Amino acid sequence: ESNGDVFETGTAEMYILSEGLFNQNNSSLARYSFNRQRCTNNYFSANNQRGLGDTANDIAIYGNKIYVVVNVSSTVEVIDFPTGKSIRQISMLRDNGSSRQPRAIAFDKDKAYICSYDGTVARIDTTSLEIEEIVTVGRNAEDICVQNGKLYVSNSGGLDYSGPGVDTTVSVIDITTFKETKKIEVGPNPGKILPGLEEAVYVVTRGTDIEAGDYHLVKIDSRTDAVAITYDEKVLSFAIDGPIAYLYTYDYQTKDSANKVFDLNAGTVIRDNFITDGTAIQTPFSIQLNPFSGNIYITEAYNYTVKGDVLCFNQQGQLQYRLNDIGLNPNTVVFSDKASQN
Ligand code: NA
Ligand code: NA
Ligand code: NA
Ligand code: NA
Ligand code: NA
Ligand code: NA
């Protein structure tokens, strides 16, 4: 169930999103209350008497709402934060009525922006919860963030691995006009994209063949909308803490992996093994900072067919605590400094 004193600084609660398995309709949403000292595994269903859906791929708290992007069900579930009750299921559909297959969400002002596999971004209003506009980006949008009055969308072209091939750009959208202003060439199969200091946007590129392990982190400059730096370190996913990145890399062929601390300014490894206390992770599956405490959260997916765990590390790579069997394939952890009225 749990190991270590389960404890956080400055944080009332965390939510853990589990994707389950492709076409098993078994995504789930867990909640651990720090205030109440209480773990609920099935917080969406328990409160709404229906499942979150198939391949839940993203979660964010913003305003007083929780948004879950559901890829295969092709929906954005919106949940009232205080009560935990569904407000709305927003169906994400092509003009012909087919699945857009949304991937990721980002917010600016009172608007949300969702990117999908069909190569589009949808603007959604955070009050009306209606889709207002669509704009096209590149192929198979994978991820999205905001930096400097602009959205940056990873054009993975991931689903084209066998046809035209993976895509190679980050689209830039101007928020005020919701017009796509440029495609910045970054490298093959871009993925996770996070904003950083000095108007920086960082993106991983996963290579033309994901099994090969040709992973780069690229830094974009948002002032000029050009690449600033391409690093040499093999990065599959990362989280930023100022000029420090917490990253990992995983080899699908050899199941070997590494978790590291990395200096974004010098482009050098600070510590070759983030973990300093000898805690094993077989399948690191996400990595993110708790912004209220600066702890590092990594998920363990094991072999993708048993329930995964959540692990909390201080920045010195000592494990604080872990929550075991939290969900099937936990891929995102999020944090509230304010308790839900639940
Ligand atoms: Na659930
Ligand atoms: Na809630
Ligand atoms: Na495609
Ligand atoms: Na992101
Ligand atoms: Na590769
Ligand atoms: Na799992």
Q: What dihedral do alpha carbons 127, 129, 132, 134 form, nearest 10°? A: 130
Please say whether the beta carbons of 327 and 310 come within 8 A: no
DSSP for 54-94? S-EEEEEEETTEEEEEETTTTEEEEEETTT--EEEEEE-B-
CA of 118 to the centre of ligand 3 (A): 7
Best CA proximity match to 310, nearest among 28, 49, 36: 28
Q: Identify the bridge partners of residue 240 per DSSP, sorted by sequence position.
A: 245
CA of 230 to the centre of ligand 5 (A): 15
As a whole number of angstroms, the distance between CA 248 and CA 125 comes to 35
Residues with Cβ < 8 Å from 114, sequence gap 6 or more?
69, 76, 92, 102, 103, 104, 105, 121, 122, 124, 144
Q: Identify the bridge partners of residue 303 per DSSP, sorted by sequence position.
A: none
Give the C-alpha distances (Å, rounded to integers) separating 143 from 26, 113, 175, 272, 278.
22, 11, 16, 27, 32
- How many residues comprise the chain? 342
Residues with Cβ < 8 Å from 223, sequence gap 6 or more?
148, 199
Nearest ligand, CA 152: 4
126 appears as a binding residue in the annotation: yes
199 appears as a binding residue in the annotation: no
Nearest ligand, CA 59: 4
Residues with Cβ < 8 Å from 109, sequence gap 6 or more?
none
321 appears as a binding residue in the annotation: no
CA atoms within 13 A on the CB side of 253: 6
As a whole number of angstroms, the distance between CA 269 and CA 176 comes to 38
283 appears as a binding residue in the annotation: no
CA of 156 to the centre of ligand 3 (A): 10
CA of 285 to the centre of ligand 6 (A): 9
Radius of gyration of the chain (CA): 19
Could you tell me the two tokens for 239? 């989280």
Core vs surface per residue 68-80: b (16+ CB within 10 A) or e: bbbbbbbbbbbbb
